[PDB]
Point group: C2
């Protein structure tokens, strides 16, 4: 019975840091997302720019670690990288190649 | 097929932590700046997760009016993410729609 935290973003993976691992083994993949669209607002269209760090886990973190040059649809939730951080990050639950 | 833009969709249920005095573009349009404060438990790789998030946000025109006095109110908000300012490194939520949370 959750409180809604849903982002879907289509965006080019701009940078993908070498893959890493929790002490427990799980694959962790840090990423920078560069987004760039025209959205509707109060009647007119808007150039939107957005660069946002993001993180992928486990299986998809390995299938995707090699894809710096690519455009993806991404679904997840927003969170602050590290308590006391004042900076939000996207925690990806699912990641397709954009074909929208 | 799709003439839609590139997908930029946030739905977020948060607390209106701060609502700045309402301002106005030179053209008249009402602008309401806000700080949103979300807490929740999300699922990730089979584990429950405590998530804390404080995010600036911004409404326009009509709803900017109805929402200027909601200090301690909890809302579902819908919009898209964007960098306030050039190079700000700091994202914000631009709300297309806001209503009282019901879940």
């Amino acid at each position: 019975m959750g409180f809604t935290n849903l982002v879907s973003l289509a965006a080019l993976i701009e940078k993908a840091f070498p893959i890493r691992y929790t002490p427990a083994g799980i694959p962790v993949l840090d990423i920078i997302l560069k987004h760039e669209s025209w959205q509707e607002e109060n009647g007119q269209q808007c150039l939107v720019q957005l660069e946002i760090p993001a993180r992928i886990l486990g299986r998809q973190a390995e299938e995707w670690q090699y894809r710096q040059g690519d455009c993806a649809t991404v679904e997840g939730f927003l969170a602050q990288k590290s308590r006391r951080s004042l900076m939000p990050m996207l925690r990806i639950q699912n990641i397709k190649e954009y074909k929208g």
